[PDB]
Design a binder for this molecule. Structure first.
Ligand SMILES: CCCCN1C(=O)C(=C/C=C/C=C2/Oc3ccccc3N2CCCS(=O)(=O)O)C(=O)N(CCCC)C1=S
Ligand SMILES: [Cl-]
Ligand SMILES: [Cl-]
Length: 129
């Protein structure tokens, strides 16, 4: 599913992501924009063999199991496929664990490089929330 800007902001808020760990909704939406362009089915193979899945491109080396990432962990206790679903519940719950891991949203390289320090509020502007 390809979410719309405000549509995703609403789903994210509905799942308690807004202001989670101090990160405003704009930040999450911005990260989703540059990680998957809002496509829940987005995947990206990394040079190390791991793979990024979903709206927030959660990686398999630590967070989900895809059975093809030697020596990896599955800290979110979910098959990586669950991160590709129309329903973002799994992705949101896993993102919550990730952002609480110590480095905040910096865990999402694209967020640091393209959202961090920017006018992220712009990402939910005009949205009926
Ligand atoms: C009627 C359909 C097209 C209208 N519509 C929009 O208005 C949407 C437009 C998004 C707004 C553009 C935008 O890109 C940004 C980049 C950085 C910061 C904010 C951004 N915003 C707008 C708010 C801030 S600003 O006004 O561009 O400065 C949109 O994403 N989408 C996707 C939502 C699909 C449900 C749609 S549908
Ligand atoms: Cl594996
Ligand atoms: Cl933080």
């Amino acid at each position: 599913k390809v979410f719309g800007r405000c549509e995703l902001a609403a789903a994210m808020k509905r799942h308690g992501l807004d202001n989670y760990r101090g990160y405003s909704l704009g930040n999450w939406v911005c990260a989703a924009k540059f990680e998957s362009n809002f496509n829940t089915q987005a995947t990206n193979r990394n040079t190390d063999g791991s793979t990024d899945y979903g709206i927030l491109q959660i990686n398999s080396r630590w967070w989900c199991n895809d059975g093809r990432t030697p020596g990896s962990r599955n800290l979110c206790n979910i098959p990586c496929s669950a991160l590709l679903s129309s329903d973002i519940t799994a992705s949101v719950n896993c993102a919550k664990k990730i952002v609480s891991d110590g480095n905040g949203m910096n865990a999402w390289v694209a967020w640091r490089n393209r959202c961090k320090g920017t006018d992220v509020q712009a990402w939910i502007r005009g949205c009926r929330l």
